[PDB]
Amino acid sequence: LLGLREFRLKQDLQGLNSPNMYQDFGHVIAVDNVTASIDPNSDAAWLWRSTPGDLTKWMGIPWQSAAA
Amino acid sequence: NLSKNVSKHRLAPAMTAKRRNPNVITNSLRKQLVISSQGSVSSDNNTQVPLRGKFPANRHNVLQGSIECDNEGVLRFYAGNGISQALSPSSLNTDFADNSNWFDDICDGRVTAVVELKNG
Amino acid sequence: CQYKIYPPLGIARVGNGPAIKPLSLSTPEVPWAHLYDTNVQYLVTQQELEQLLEEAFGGNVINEISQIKTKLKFKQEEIETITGLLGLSHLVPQQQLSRSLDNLEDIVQQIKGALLKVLSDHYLHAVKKQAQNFYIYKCDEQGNPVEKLKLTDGDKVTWRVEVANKKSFWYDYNNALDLSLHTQGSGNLSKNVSKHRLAPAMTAKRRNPNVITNSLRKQLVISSQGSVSSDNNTQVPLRGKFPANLQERHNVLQGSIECDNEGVLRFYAGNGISQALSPSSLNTDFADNSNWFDDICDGRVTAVVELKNGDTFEIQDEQSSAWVATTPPDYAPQIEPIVTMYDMVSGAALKEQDLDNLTTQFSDVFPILYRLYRMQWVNQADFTDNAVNTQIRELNSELGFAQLLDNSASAKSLREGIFNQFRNPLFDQDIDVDDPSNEWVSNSRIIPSKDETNIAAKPATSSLKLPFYPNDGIDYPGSPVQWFAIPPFMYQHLQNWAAGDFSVTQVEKESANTIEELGLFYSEQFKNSPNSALLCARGALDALYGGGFHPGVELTWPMRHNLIYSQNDYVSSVTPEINLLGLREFRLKQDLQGLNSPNMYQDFGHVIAVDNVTASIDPNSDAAWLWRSTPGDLTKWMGIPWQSAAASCQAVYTPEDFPIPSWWAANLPVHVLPLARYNKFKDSQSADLPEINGMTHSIAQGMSEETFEHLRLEQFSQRLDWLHTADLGFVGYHAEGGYTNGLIQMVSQWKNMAMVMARPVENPGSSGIPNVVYVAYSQADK
Amino acid sequence: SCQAVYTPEDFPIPSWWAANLPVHVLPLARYNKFKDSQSADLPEINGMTHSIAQGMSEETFEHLRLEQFSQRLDWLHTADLGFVGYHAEGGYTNGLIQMVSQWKNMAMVMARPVENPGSSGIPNVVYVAYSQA
Amino acid sequence: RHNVLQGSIECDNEGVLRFYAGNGISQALSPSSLNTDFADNSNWFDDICDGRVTAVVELKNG
Ligand SMILES: [Mg+2]
Ligand SMILES: [Mg+2]
């Protein structure tokens, strides 16, 4: 039945007090930034180590417009 | 989840994306665009605690959720009331994803706990 | 190398005037030749049509008529005869001439007035075409042009032109892709823009994306070609189809070509007709509108010279061939852009790291100040909100302009005070750095997005630098690249000027008591410079804009890269002692197969991105075709249709009222001085007219002299939004107006927009009004 | 909606009720660029440095004053009624919408003095439109 | 100036008139003038029409 898995998100252990809470990539985001984020030692790797707000920030603002 | 042919053969190229609310400049001032809240609940008291932030942050109160713990130690998390709003009534949300001047009460974050047994 | 075509890049502008010499204009062949010419007529005049119609008479026409006055309301073959005799079918469709003589009943005057009416309805006040003349020049044992080809009996020249439009085939214009292109820096663009991510290049999707497969997208390309020779001066149309070949099809006149018996080619652009395939497809975007085509084009100009002794010379290689591009009209031909397309050519040859070796004369700096000064006629901020232009007026008022030519310590604070107001194209001033990941955020005035956020703006701590125009990075609030800077090499000239490291001749000093005296002097230096081939090359481009590029007016950012030229060499000063930014030999890179190139229909798939530009830098790379132009490649980047981009090329308002930022005001004016106002300050109090400056003779002369002169200046000072010089959707009760209706209405109203022309004020007295003013003519008037 | 109604002809521009809802006004920014005389002992005179303002001829100084005085601004542009920013639509309808909040920021006309008009042709009392400032 | 085909008429040898309406072509004088109202759109025309039908009968005896 497609199986059972043990999985867990990467987390920034400082949460709301993480120094990466308010990181971005400047005027635009592009696949170049995601490419760089693959390297765990890059200055972009923080993209995958979630602080609060990181999972839902991509979605439509407000969600109602996106749903319609 | 995703074949290598999509990128390899340029089947749907990733687009660049600009900032939402681009008129807010400098990282320090853009921190105001983030809504955040926190709370704690324990086994000894099942009173519900709201997770209430502000937008812009430090003006509207945003109920991002509510938390409850029962005497058994299970945590119950309620999301918000489904209120989305613009800072001005005339700012209408005409794009499917990217509407400046808008906030909603969606959120995500970190769940931790500490277990305190009677033996110390 | 034996014979060469000049100019290397010719420019012809669309207009609804006819493609005939007496009623058209010529692209400048000498820079600054007509800046103060108060007799210019850029719109077709009643007097020109009347002369054309007189010219078409007799010919025997008078008594070919009078012969049937006796033999009688006319017949067909009666009239079919008396048309045709006037060679006017090439200006007006044959039928309408017939319908005009039908409603008739001294008869060679009912005949004239009836024909004048139809000519007038078609052409009166029409935007004259700006045609480009191309010349063949005999060369040297060094490819130096010496003199124009002079044909003798038996000699023949044949011109060939092949042009295309690929706007509807190409990609969206979101911003300049080179803003993210890794570079060491050039004379046109600092490495800071890309290095510090000041205005990232965006991806761009395809125009008309529902047309899929390369084979079917070929229909989106409009192309045509033709040939003319010195043995036959008949004009040849360059006519294509959109979509190209139960498909409904439209003829597109991309241009017209003529060759005279001396061998000079004259190229006319189209009539300014843009259209969608369905009437309901409205052009609501500044640059990317599907289902639309326009009659802009560009392409390859070649020739072959046949001498009487059998010798044949093919002008086909990229070193000796030429190119042509058509463009929107120039609505203020005597007002030059502050940074021109010729400046881009010059800058493209220079490396940012080597600008320390640049040598500066005052004649290299004067064009910046002179052009900015003259923007007052097309832009309010440069008339009433520009501290440099006001200081020039101070100096002019005490005959003290020559101080700016002084390179000594005593004038250093004067020079420096002007220089310090100009924006630095390093884009590294007036910024605060987040994370010294570093982002440069401007602490000067930003240009906000329309997408508002009701959060207090950060107060600006630094003054807004000059000039007050938007730029390539306008999409990014807080980027220093939101605002236009003169390019690195021109800023270097101005920095050398401020420092005192510049030379100037005493003769220049003696003609420099006012800015106009010196401008007149420099104009004479161009006029008398003996290199007519290179002056013609520069004049073709000095009237075109050279920034910002969003996308621009005529051409866009690829032109600022040396990659696009197969040759780009300094040759000489304009005058032995006076550089005036110099004369250069340059040629475009060309695909020698033209319309038949296998790269004619190349693209990069679903999007274009700076990565494709990165890959194109290597000339052995698969992507290098991007720089080896085939017909249509220069203009395909531009807005489709051009009229929407022109309507979007105006003001960008900030929350602060003044200065009003303006995109490209020298060629698409933003604030103009209407004819209505000229007619209210033209006259002096002593004028022998029943109406003086819009007042009765009696009222004009009854008032004090001081009051009369004050009223003149008040009228002179009333500047009108250029968008209001025709009905762009704001006319009438509860008219919506607004940006989008401007885009839509410009498709038909472009030909009715105000055209700026120098005009005289015979006796300004003490009014403060110069003897030459630049006046905007449109039918909205008055 | 109580402003100009443009005709195909440019001038005169028709205006509805301009005495109470002005249509073209003389902004403070312009007042600050003509109110001073050339003898003013200030580092900035009519928006020019002291040195520039006193270096120019008296005739040119007065001409600059009158040019500024003659710059009249659409009253609808004295606050953000939907025309501000890159690609702002502007237009009639956004004006109607934005005035609900922006009425309180529109320019207010007040009589103000010109102490020394000299020969400029500017009257000793002018009526100046203040907005946000 | 636009040509408007309002209809077409035919008569057969038995004397019956056949009347065809237009092709269904509606248009404005400018392509930017869009017909956003259910009933009242300035600058528009259509090929609908209505009018008067008469005849004369001519017998061989005069
Ligand atoms: Mg111009
Ligand atoms: Mg009142």
Side-chain angles (χ1 to χ4, degrees):
Chain A
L1 274 164
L2 294 170
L4 299 175
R5 303 185 76 84
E6 177 74 40
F7 56 97
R8 314 211 84 81
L9 287 171
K10 277 179 192 166
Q11 297 196 47
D12 189 316
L13 289 343
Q14 268 181 107
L16 237 33
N17 299 315
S18 172
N20 292 325
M21 181 68 185
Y22 304 98
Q23 282 277 32
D24 69 18
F25 292 108
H27 285 294
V28 309
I29 186 165
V31 61
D32 277 4
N33 307 116
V34 183
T35 299
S37 74
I38 302 301
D39 182 358
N41 297 313
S42 164
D43 70 347
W46 60 266
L47 190 61
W48 301 101
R49 188 160 299 286
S50 297
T51 67
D54 277 0
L55 287 210
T56 54
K57 62 183 174 185
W58 305 89
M59 313 304 293
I61 171 68
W63 68 266
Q64 283 92 342
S65 324
Chain B
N1 293 333
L2 185 67
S3 169
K4 86 162 285 146
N5 282 344
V6 176
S7 56
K8 177 184 205 261
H9 292 277
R10 298 170 288 104
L11 268 31
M15 285 172 238
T16 51
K18 298 184 285 192
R19 285 186 171 114
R20 294 161 174 170
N21 297 286
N23 293 340
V24 186
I25 64 172
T26 76
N27 186 246
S28 171
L29 286 170
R30 289 189 67 79
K31 291 179 181 174
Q32 306 173 262
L33 297 166
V34 176
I35 314 165
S36 56
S37 56
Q38 59 172 297
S40 283
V41 290
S42 69
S43 256
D44 291 357
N45 185 358
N46 65 28
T47 292
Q48 184 182 103
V49 174
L51 299 173
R52 188 171 284 110
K54 297 211 163 192
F55 184 91
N58 187 281
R59 195 179 263 250
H60 306 258
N61 283 304
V62 181
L63 182 66
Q64 302 181 302
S66 294
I67 52 177
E68 269 170 11
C69 194
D70 70 6
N71 61 47
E72 309 280 48
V74 7
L75 167 70
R76 192 167 172 80
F77 185 105
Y78 300 88
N81 297 337
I83 291 160
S84 307
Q85 205 177 317
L87 293 177
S88 170
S90 69
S91 291
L92 292 192
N93 55 309
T94 58
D95 189 73
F96 78 106
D98 308 316
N99 304 288
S100 290
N101 218 23
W102 276 83
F103 62 95
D104 71 14
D105 56 0
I106 300 297
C107 73
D108 64 283
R110 173 166 157 79
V111 184
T112 61
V114 54
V115 178
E116 210 128 40
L117 299 178
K118 88 184 77 113
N119 59 12
Chain C
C1 183
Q2 344 219 21
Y3 296 129
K4 280 184 163 156
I5 294 164
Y6 287 85
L9 209 211
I11 301 298
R13 306 189 176 255
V14 298
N16 61 325
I20 61 178
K21 288 192 194 210
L23 268 60
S24 64
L25 308 169
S26 292
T27 297
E29 305 180 11
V30 181
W32 293 9
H34 285 258
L35 292 189
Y36 296 104
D37 181 353
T38 59
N39 298 321
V40 294
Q41 301 297 337
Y42 302 146
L43 304 178
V44 179
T45 63
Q46 184 86 22
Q47 161 175 328
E48 290 160 356
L49 296 171
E50 277 159 13
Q51 183 57 53
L52 187 68
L53 162 134
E54 301 277 358
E55 219 103 13
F57 268 44
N60 196 49
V61 167
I62 305 182
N63 60 266
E64 238 285 43
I65 286 166
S66 185
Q67 107 173 30
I68 87 268
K69 190 235 88 61
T70 57
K71 298 185 207 229
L72 266 343
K73 172 41 58 189
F74 302 162
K75 284 228 73 75
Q76 169 157 230
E77 229 258 83
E78 187 89 55
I79 281 179
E80 288 286 341
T81 321
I82 108 183
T83 69
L85 258 330
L86 350 301
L88 295 183
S89 277
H90 70 306
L91 308 171
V92 175
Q94 175 61 93
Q95 316 102 265
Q96 298 182 16
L97 303 163
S98 314
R99 330 257 323 192
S100 78
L101 304 170
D102 188 61
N103 337 337
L104 301 230
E105 43 104 73
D106 164 285
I107 17 67
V108 187
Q109 213 68 181
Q110 292 190 9
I111 224 80
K112 269 171 171 248
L115 294 174
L116 188 65
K117 173 74 181 192
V118 313
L119 294 175
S120 205
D121 288 356
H122 276 247
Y123 293 123
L124 185 61
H125 306 305
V127 174
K128 293 180 166 174
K129 296 184 195 300
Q130 186 189 300
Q132 176 75 67
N133 298 323
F134 288 90
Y135 305 86
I136 293 192
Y137 273 79
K138 186 106 137 83
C139 285
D140 261 353
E141 292 177 350
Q142 221 40 225
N144 278 78
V146 307
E147 69 196 79
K148 292 209 255 268
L149 182 68
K150 182 80 196 70
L151 296 179
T152 64
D153 193 74
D155 297 349
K156 184 196 195 183
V157 54
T158 304
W159 295 85
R160 191 191 175 191
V161 183
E162 48 199 310
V163 301
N165 176 311
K166 298 170 170 176
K167 292 188 184 182
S168 316
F169 168 90
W170 195 239
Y171 295 90
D172 285 347
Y173 197 96
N174 295 320
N175 69 358
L177 287 175
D178 63 349
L179 295 169
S180 287
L181 187 68
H182 205 95
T183 186
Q184 286 312 119
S186 74
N188 295 323
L189 185 69
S190 175
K191 77 176 169 79
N192 279 344
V193 175
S194 66
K195 182 212 238 266
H196 291 277
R197 296 167 275 106
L198 267 28
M202 294 179 219
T203 49
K205 299 180 286 197
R206 288 183 165 112
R207 285 163 180 168
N208 292 284
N210 289 339
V211 187
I212 64 172
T213 77
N214 181 254
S215 185
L216 293 172
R217 293 186 64 78
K218 289 179 184 178
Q219 311 169 264
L220 295 169
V221 171
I222 315 167
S223 62
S224 56
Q225 70 158 92
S227 287
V228 290
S229 81
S230 47
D231 293 335
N232 180 0
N233 65 18
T234 301
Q235 182 181 100
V236 171
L238 301 170
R239 190 169 293 107
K241 295 199 176 274
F242 184 88
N245 220 6
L246 195 250
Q247 176 70 66
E248 339 83 59
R249 225 152 223 122
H250 301 263
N251 286 308
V252 188
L253 180 68
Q254 298 181 298
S256 298
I257 51 173
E258 275 166 8
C259 192
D260 70 12
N261 72 99
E262 283 282 58
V264 47
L265 167 68
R266 188 167 174 80
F267 182 106
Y268 297 89
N271 297 334
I273 294 162
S274 314
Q275 205 180 309
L277 293 179
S278 169
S280 71
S281 289
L282 291 193
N283 58 315
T284 57
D285 185 77
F286 77 102
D288 311 317
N289 302 286
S290 284
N291 215 26
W292 277 83
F293 64 96
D294 73 17
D295 57 350
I296 294 296
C297 75
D298 73 274
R300 173 168 156 77
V301 184
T302 56
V304 40
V305 175
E306 161 185 349
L307 300 177
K308 68 190 84 157
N309 53 84
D311 283 2
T312 286
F313 296 95
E314 244 111 43
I315 325 306
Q316 290 200 259
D317 66 315
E318 62 186 356
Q319 213 68 176
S320 64
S321 295
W323 205 263
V324 70
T326 69
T327 79
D330 183 354
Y331 291 89
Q334 293 156 309
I335 304 297
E336 196 171 54
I338 183 170
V339 178
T340 73
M341 186 54 68
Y342 181 80
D343 299 322
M344 292 294 101
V345 178
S346 306
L350 296 171
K351 270 88 93 148
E352 195 181 6
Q353 302 298 358
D354 296 352
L355 297 175
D356 292 340
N357 304 335
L358 197 60
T359 189
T360 301
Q361 293 176 3
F362 183 78
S363 69
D364 299 311
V365 146
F366 180 76
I368 292 141
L369 301 177
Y370 194 38
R371 293 161 176 174
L372 186 57
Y373 183 73
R374 286 170 63 79
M375 291 294 291
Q376 66 178 282
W377 301 105
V378 294
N379 189 44
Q380 183 193 36
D382 293 317
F383 175 43
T384 42
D385 298 289
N386 183 321
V388 170
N389 286 351
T390 295
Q391 178 174 13
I392 288 165
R393 283 194 55 178
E394 176 232 348
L395 298 179
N396 287 339
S397 78
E398 299 293 11
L399 305 178
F401 186 92
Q403 305 172 247
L404 300 182
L405 283 67
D406 186 340
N407 64 7
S408 82
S410 61
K412 187 156 148 83
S413 62
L414 174 60
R415 304 188 312 266
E416 279 179 330
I418 291 168
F419 164 73
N420 290 340
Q421 299 176 55
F422 280 77
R423 178 168 293 99
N424 189 327
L426 287 164
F427 292 109
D428 69 351
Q429 310 293 317
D430 303 330
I431 55 158
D432 299 315
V433 182
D434 281 340
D435 293 13
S437 64
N438 66 98
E439 287 300 303
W440 292 6
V441 188
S442 162
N443 57 30
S444 190
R445 188 177 294 174
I446 71 168
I447 301 181
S449 172
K450 68 175 178 59
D451 292 328
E452 321 196 78
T453 304
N454 297 128
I455 287 171
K458 191 177 183 279
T461 55
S462 73
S463 63
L464 182 60
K465 302 301 186 297
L466 286 166
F468 298 135
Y469 316 142
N471 191 28
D472 312 341
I474 205 254
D475 304 283
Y476 301 109
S479 174
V481 188
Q482 288 203 290
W483 299 91
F484 184 73
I486 61 175
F489 87 96
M490 289 176 103
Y491 189 84
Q492 182 73 57
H493 281 317
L494 206 67
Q495 174 133 229
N496 294 348
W497 174 68
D501 301 333
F502 73 96
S503 66
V504 68
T505 65
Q506 183 64 32
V507 172
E508 282 164 279
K509 287 195 184 194
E510 239 90 339
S511 290
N513 292 304
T514 65
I515 194 162
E516 288 95 358
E517 188 187 8
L518 186 55
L520 240 294
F521 170 90
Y522 283 145
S523 163
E524 281 290 307
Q525 301 319 297
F526 284 115
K527 179 179 149 269
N528 296 320
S529 167
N531 201 320
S532 66
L534 269 31
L535 290 162
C536 146
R538 172 174 177 172
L541 266 34
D542 248 350
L544 274 61
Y545 254 90
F549 294 111
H550 205 269
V553 186
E554 301 96 356
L555 305 168
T556 190
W557 59 267
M559 306 300 301
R560 69 173 160 205
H561 293 267
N562 228 12
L563 264 332
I564 199 137
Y565 310 103
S566 58
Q567 172 185 11
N568 191 8
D569 297 314
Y570 183 80
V571 310
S572 82
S573 297
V574 169
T575 268
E577 272 80 40
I578 298 171
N579 193 61
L580 278 166
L581 294 172
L583 298 178
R584 303 185 65 80
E585 178 69 45
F586 59 95
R587 326 291 297 196
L588 284 176
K589 270 190 196 159
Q590 300 194 36
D591 187 320
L592 282 353
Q593 291 192 77
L595 294 172
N596 293 308
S597 166
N599 293 319
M600 183 71 185
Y601 302 105
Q602 283 269 26
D603 69 17
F604 297 107
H606 289 295
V607 310
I608 188 164
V610 63
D611 281 2
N612 303 122
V613 184
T614 295
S616 71
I617 304 306
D618 185 330
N620 294 324
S621 209
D622 56 342
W625 57 267
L626 186 65
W627 300 100
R628 186 160 295 283
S629 293
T630 65
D633 279 353
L634 293 207
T635 59
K636 64 187 176 180
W637 302 90
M638 308 305 289
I640 173 63
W642 67 263
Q643 286 98 342
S644 338
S648 199
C649 180
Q650 290 284 289
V652 188
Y653 298 96
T654 53
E656 301 83 10
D657 284 317
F658 306 117
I660 295 167
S662 57
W663 271 110
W664 300 297
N667 287 11
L668 293 167
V670 177
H671 309 101
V672 299
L673 186 49
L675 170 62
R677 299 298 164 201
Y678 177 63
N679 286 335
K680 294 188 187 194
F681 68 75
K682 187 181 16 93
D683 311 307
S684 54
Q685 201 161 23
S686 63
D688 185 20
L689 302 164
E691 176 178 84
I692 293 172
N693 286 341
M695 301 168 284
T696 63
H697 179 87
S698 157
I699 290 171
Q701 304 214 323
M703 63 177 56
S704 68
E705 184 139 69
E706 303 93 312
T707 288
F708 181 89
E709 306 274 61
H710 290 147
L711 289 170
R712 292 180 93 168
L713 227 215
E714 285 169 9
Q715 294 291 345
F716 173 86
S717 296
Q718 302 306 299
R719 304 300 167 89
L720 176 63
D721 287 14
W722 182 74
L723 254 15
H724 282 190
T725 59
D727 184 3
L728 290 176
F730 64 87
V731 175
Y733 178 51
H734 285 171
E736 181 60 41
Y739 169 87
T740 301
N741 277 313
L743 305 205
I744 294 158
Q745 291 303 317
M746 191 65 71
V747 165
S748 61
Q749 294 312 299
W750 67 274
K751 64 179 163 286
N752 303 320
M753 306 299 302
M755 175 67 64
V756 175
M757 290 181 266
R759 289 292 182 259
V761 179
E762 296 306 342
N763 295 282
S766 61
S767 75
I769 292 162
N771 290 88
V772 176
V773 298
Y774 297 82
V775 177
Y777 286 76
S778 69
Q779 278 318 92
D781 236 325
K782 86 201 172 194
Chain D
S1 202
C2 179
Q3 290 286 286
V5 189
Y6 297 94
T7 44
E9 302 79 13
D10 283 333
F11 308 114
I13 295 171
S15 51
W16 269 111
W17 299 303
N20 291 12
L21 294 171
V23 173
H24 311 103
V25 295
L26 182 51
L28 174 64
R30 300 298 167 202
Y31 178 61
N32 285 339
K33 294 191 180 188
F34 67 78
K35 63 172 186 183
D36 300 319
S37 59
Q38 192 172 31
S39 60
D41 195 328
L42 306 170
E44 180 171 276
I45 300 172
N46 286 343
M48 302 166 281
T49 64
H50 181 94
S51 157
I52 288 166
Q54 305 208 330
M56 64 179 57
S57 75
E58 171 100 284
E59 312 89 280
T60 287
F61 186 86
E62 311 279 50
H63 291 157
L64 293 171
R65 291 179 90 182
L66 219 208
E67 285 169 24
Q68 296 288 341
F69 173 85
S70 298
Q71 300 305 296
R72 306 302 166 92
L73 179 62
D74 282 14
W75 182 76
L76 251 22
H77 282 200
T78 59
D80 184 357
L81 291 182
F83 62 88
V84 171
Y86 179 50
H87 283 175
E89 179 61 37
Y92 170 82
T93 294
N94 282 314
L96 306 209
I97 293 168
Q98 293 307 311
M99 189 66 77
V100 166
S101 55
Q102 294 304 306
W103 66 276
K104 65 177 98 74
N105 299 325
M106 307 300 298
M108 173 70 64
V109 176
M110 296 184 262
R112 289 297 185 252
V114 180
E115 306 302 348
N116 223 276
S119 63
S120 72
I122 291 163
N124 287 89
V125 177
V126 296
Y127 296 83
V128 177
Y130 288 71
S131 64
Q132 99 234 2
Chain E
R1 227 88 171 196
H2 298 260
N3 281 316
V4 189
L5 179 64
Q6 300 184 295
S8 300
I9 51 174
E10 279 165 9
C11 189
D12 71 11
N13 54 28
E14 306 281 0
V16 46
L17 168 67
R18 191 167 173 82
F19 183 110
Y20 296 92
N23 298 334
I25 293 166
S26 306
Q27 210 177 319
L29 295 178
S30 168
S32 63
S33 293
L34 295 191
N35 56 313
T36 56
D37 187 74
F38 81 100
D40 307 314
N41 299 288
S42 282
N43 216 26
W44 277 81
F45 66 91
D46 68 19
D47 52 354
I48 298 293
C49 77
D50 73 274
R52 170 167 161 76
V53 181
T54 65
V56 48
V57 172
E58 233 168 348
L59 304 179
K60 60 189 69 179
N61 59 292

